[PDB]
């Protein structure tokens, strides 16, 4: 009647009263949703036990630890025995909610923490768990969906940029299919994947897309133009890298090339000379730039690239 | 060998050959991603058939209708028969996309709409819906989890504005349980909700909680105070109206009360003089404001309630 409001974890509030009761002991007070909850405790800070009764003989079982560092709020059926929710709270939150179907059997969990990372963990008729949302403190997420093998049938993983991986599963729940939407819209897309994770593999760029496989760690993307062969290769890192090779036997003609990992820079030479740098650029673009007669100095403005057909003009 | 670009439905560009080839006929130029198609037609305005075989003998048959209003991209294995891909779009965008597994199946389905719009569709191993991802023009999306009956197991609806509606079924696909969070973080839940839509409901507000019970067409909140019963419903749409009853006799002391939907206000009555103002905000909010001693104007300032002790001290 009169006594002081503490606050526990969960942003909830209890009123304890500052004066005994007969057994020694001190009163608890608390409104869960519209019940209000009472107990009696030997301690006068607030912990303890509180319990109420629903208007429909539902229980309710409010549990605070001794250092007020964590609460545990139960809801049973009319029973006082099979569980309607259950919610566990500490610093600073730091917490675990459960959610059980008429029949007292889990049907989500979420477990949410103090930077704000949500795992939610949802469960299926047969109570096996069907599909998971994993939320870090940036807002990049996971959403991983299940079947009856208990295995992944379906993954998407979005970054707050947009930029996101989209996978499909097959029938022994190995991957089969991964498409990477990056940042700017260009795509990477494998299919017809293996068990030893070997494909096809097809970059889509701005207006035009390069084609080739899938290997251990590597992407191998492929042009051809008469006898050369230009090769842009992707890591396990997502290392860029690139090479080519020229069948063409005579001094004359024969292009050979020198990739610059610094620059990000494939430079080609013909007959001693350097002819064209290519230059593959942080927005997923190609720009081709000639030389001099003498090769030692480019000459006019870097071009940006529009379609297959320049980049084996850049080969002929 | 080559005169006259034309622009195509799904952002493609045809070379159509100006004047006729070795028979009539016109010769036709497309490149879909890595490949150049090629083809014949009748017509020389840039309709009619490419196909193409990819390196690793895979077919891709491009169909650009007489008058340039649908194109249709398909992709085979080798065998020219089982599908890959088949993308089919029309004026203007208004295109729907089609992806199938190793074995000819369909795997997903993307049907996007002239006004941005989407309707997303996954497959599972008896090609029946999985989940669907619908996504109207202003943003809003709309999730759908299907049980391994293709019933509903779990729904998911965000509005534009942030508030959502979270809902899950039982084993018939009926629906037992329904949250909806506000664009303002106050909710309703219903739980428990049987096959003609009865069940228990709550409101959670900033700092109290009412209870009470749902209905084919109503919420029906309600805090009782000794004799008196105040009965807030939210309608099949979501219209607030107000009602009080007090079973107390006497006229000297027993409550009535007068609801004011254009103003939203609920005007207490005792003894013939006006007490009270409750008034339920479009913040989701109640305030009190009490009457003069004559029952004629308002005294002082409205003051909001914060818990649920209030609503009751209120109704006293």
Known sequence: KNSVSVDLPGSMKVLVSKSSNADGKYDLI????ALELSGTSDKNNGSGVLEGVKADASKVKLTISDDLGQTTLEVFKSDGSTL???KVTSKDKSSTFELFNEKGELSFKLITRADKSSTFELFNEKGELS?????????????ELFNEKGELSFKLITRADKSSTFELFNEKGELSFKLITRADGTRLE???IKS?????????????????????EKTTLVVKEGTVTLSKNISKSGEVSVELNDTDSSAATKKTAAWNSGTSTLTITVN????????????NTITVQQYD????????????????????????
């Open 30 to 33: 608390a409104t869960v949703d």
């Open 84 to 86: 309607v929710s259950k």
């Open 131 to 143: 599909f998971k949302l994993i939320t870090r403190a940036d807002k990049s997420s996971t959403f």
């Open 190 to 192: 494998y299919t017809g």
């Open 196 to 216: 030893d994770g070997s494909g096809k593999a097809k970059e889509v760029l701005k207006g035009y897309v390069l084609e080739g496989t899938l290997t251990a």
């Open 272 to 283: 001693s000379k350097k002819t064209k740098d290519l230059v593959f650029t942080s927005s």
């Open 293 to 316: 007669s003498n090769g030692t100095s480019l000459e006019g403005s870097a071009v940006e690239i529009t379609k297959l057909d320049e980049i084996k003009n850049a080969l002929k």
